[PDB]
Amino acid sequence: EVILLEKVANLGNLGDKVNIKGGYARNFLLPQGKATVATAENVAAFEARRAELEKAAAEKKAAAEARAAQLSELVVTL
RNA sequence: AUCGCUGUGAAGAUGCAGUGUAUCCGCGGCUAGACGGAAAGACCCCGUGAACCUUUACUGUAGCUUUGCACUGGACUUUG
Predict the structure, then answer these.
(1) Could you tell me the residue range of the domain that residue A54 belongs to?
(2) Strand B atom within 7 Å of A18 CB
(3) Total structural domains within chain A
(4) Chain B bases having any atom below 7 Å from a protein CB
(5) Is the distance between the Cβ of A7 and the closest atom of strand B smaller than 7 Å?
């Protein structure tokens, strides 16, 4: 009953509409910018924004390339 | 207009009966009677009366506790 928008999770899709538990929509999926309820108020507004998502969602692993190269140097002094 | 006695009597009499005493009226005292006064007996019984206490009386119930379903999610596994 939700529209998923991210894929780096355990079961996060982007174009499948799944039926999940009621508390899993309320407290996690909706308030994190990660879904919206299956309403027909902007369901045709999703279809005019299908090519704005293909920019930032692809750099999401590309900006995690060189940022990860300073995460494993282990240069924190205790 | 308020005596004793002995009987009688709702069964212990100033008042009935019979009979003895006894002029009329205070004051001071004493308490034997007036089943003296005081409190619609406290004991006892009664009431399909009450109240409050008790419990292993009856019926409940606050509180405590158990599980089901809500609030309440994902993710692998032991597992059917």
Answers:
(1) 1-78
(2) no
(3) 1
(4) 71-76
(5) no
